[PDB]
A paper describes a structure:
Here we use a geometric deep-learning framework operating on protein surfaces that generates fingerprints to describe geometric and chemical features that are critical to drive protein–protein interactions. As a proof of principle, we computationally designed several de novo protein binders to engage four protein targets: SARS-CoV-2 spike, PD-1, PD-L1 and CTLA-4. Guided by these general principles of molecular recognition, we introduce a protein design approach based on the critical importance of the fully buried patches of the interface to drive protein interactions. Overall, our surface-centric approach captures the physical and chemical determinants of molecular recognition, enabling an approach for the de novo design of protein interactions and, more broadly, of artificial proteins with function.
We applied our surface-centric approach to design de novo binders to target the SARS-CoV-2 RBD. We selected a site distinct from the ACE2-binding region, but overlapping such that a putative binder could inhibit the ACE2–RBD interaction. We next sought to improve the binding affinity of the design by generating two mutagenesis libraries: first, a directed library in the designed interface was prepared, which yielded DBR3_02 with four mutations and a dissociation constant (KD) of 4.6 µM determined by SPR. Second, we screened a site-saturation mutagenesis (SSM) library, which resulted in the enrichment of three point mutants, one of which overlapped with a mutation from the first library. Adding these three mutations to DBR3_02 resulted in DBR3_03, which showed a KD of 80 nM and was folded and stable. To structurally characterize the binding mode of DBR3_03, we solved a cryo-electron microscopy (cryo-EM) structure of the design in a complex with the trimeric spike protein at a local resolution of 2.9 Å. The structure confirmed the predicted binding sites on both partners. Importantly, the binder adopted the orientation of the helical binding seed that was marginally less favoured by MaSIF’s fingerprint descriptors (down orientation). Notably, the initial design DBR3_01 showed similar metrics when the interfaces were analysed in both directions, pointing to known limitations of surface fingerprints in the unbound docking type of problems. This led us to use another state-of-the-art protein docking method, AlphaFold Multimer26, to predict the complex of DBR3_03 with the spike RBD, and we obtained a 1.4 Å iRMSD between the AlphaFold prediction and the experimental structure. The designed interface lacks canonical hotspot residues and engages the RBD through small residues and is composed of 21% backbone and 79% side-chain contacts.
Numbering used by the authors:
A (entry chain A): 350 to 549
B (entry chain B): 27 to 69, 80 to 143, 159 to 173, 186 to 245, 264 to 299
C (entry chain D), D (entry chain h): 1 to 65
Amino acid sequence: VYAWNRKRISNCVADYSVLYNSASFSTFKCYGVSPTKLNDLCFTNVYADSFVIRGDEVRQIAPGQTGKIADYNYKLPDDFTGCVIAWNSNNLDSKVGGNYNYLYRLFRKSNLKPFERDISTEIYQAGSTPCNGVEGFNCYFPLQSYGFQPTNGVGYQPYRVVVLSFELLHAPATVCGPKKSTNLVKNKCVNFNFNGLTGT
Amino acid sequence: AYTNSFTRGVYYPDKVFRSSVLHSTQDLFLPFFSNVTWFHAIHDNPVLPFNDGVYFASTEKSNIIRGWIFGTTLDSKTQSLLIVNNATNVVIKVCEFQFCNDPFLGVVYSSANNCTFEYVSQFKNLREFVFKNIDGYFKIYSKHTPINLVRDLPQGFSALEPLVDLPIGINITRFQTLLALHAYYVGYLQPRTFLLKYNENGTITDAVDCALDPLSET
Amino acid sequence: TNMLEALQQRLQFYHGQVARAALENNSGKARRFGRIVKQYEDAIKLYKAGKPVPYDELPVPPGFG
Amino acid sequence: TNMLEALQQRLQFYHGQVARAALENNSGKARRFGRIVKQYEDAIKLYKAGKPVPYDELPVPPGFG
Ligand SMILES: *[C@@H]1O[C@H](CO)[C@@H](O)[C@H](O)[C@H]1NC(C)=O
Ligand SMILES: *[C@@H]1O[C@H](CO)[C@@H](O)[C@H](O)[C@H]1NC(C)=O
Ligand SMILES: *[C@@H]1O[C@H](CO)[C@@H](O)[C@H](O)[C@H]1NC(C)=O
């Protein structure tokens, strides 16, 4: 949760067709655009953010509904966020012992600015200055594990969430959806649209 | 040093086929019989302004003149375009790089801060190139076929056909040429008006500038 | 501070060292400190439930206060 | 679908029964239907605000799915 792999999706013919059509995705909610507009506007560049959270924390990723995850780990501004995709990874994750690698930050100075990543791990509280060590009445090491054992309920089962929030209107278009085509005819009065060149 | 570009630097302005027709177009062209700053840097690559597109030529048939860096501040602060030949792949990097003092290249790297776009593609010889940047599109024209009408001088007529188009959409004002460690022309083009002649094939065989001579205007 | 606050402040150190072990990607010791965390969780719950506290044999961190 | 979409889809049924009550021109059950409609409106408002969820004693429609 505390980090996220942001990747460059550009120079692409992105279908968005296999997406939103398969039932593997538990939540497919879009805000800036209506989910049905596969070839919508040929937007400029795409942001992709991937992380794994609990079942209940899904509602907090959306704009508003700020919670512990939203306040100190991932801040999403109230703008045209593309879509939110989340599914259940109880089969892949959640070993019998329980995955302990997934971490979340419970203590931080202030709410993270939108799309700001904090990889640093350090002691936070201080106050009485007993810190610079893990032992202290107020040091409170920030990161804490999740405990994603299979016996946990769906509320605490791990969910694999990817936030597709494409960049909007900032440069000439580079990535867009596929253009439908059809067979051609000869020796008939037919109006044509060859690569945008219209005519009859 | 200065040199006269007789009638070189005419390119196909669009992707429209024509045959046996005289078409007049108004576009950014290099005027006939202009002055080009002859550079002869051997045993010296200054930063030159872009100034709404540039002309370029060369005469050495080996890999010594390699790259063309474009940008506005030549620092990691601002997005900077880079084109370098590897003799097997042409690498195009628009990502931010810091200042290069004495770049040596041939078949410099400081840091790729905020890397965003990348691209990969495929008598002596003449490599005449035309660089243009309009409405966020960077167009590169080329012609690698040399004609020995006269020796040691670039005289004759040759048309330039487009090679690549980049939708980078960046602001560039200065450009520089990259060399190695151990003769290229520069011309600026203005919005002139030309009358171009097409062959039976869609090839341009002759062009006439019409801000140079009352006969030409006629 | 009584017993509740002491145990609540006690258990967070074990949470921190579990997090550090997970960062170290060694899950051998991580299981042991996770068992310690669960022990102290049930200890706090038992104390708050109003039952005898098993403070006699539970492990000790470096410091009482 | 979480909870938000479920309540949003439930509220339409109660607006519909309000509509039928209005059409049948007796305002008796119409008032009760409107009261539970505002109750659900507050329910979605508080759930979207991020507040404790009273999904325990609120009235329920015929169907969970
Ligand atoms: C182009 O040149 C070779 C050919 O395979 C190889 O190193 C690579 O594909 C390219 N080199 C680059 C991108 O530096
Ligand atoms: C360049 O690197 C710095 C590192 O502090 C970073 O803050 C900045 O965003 C980078 N440049 C761009 C254009 O992102
Ligand atoms: C046109 O192209 C053909 C292709 O071989 C060539 O033979 C011919 O000479 C060219 N010019 C004309 C005027 O046909």
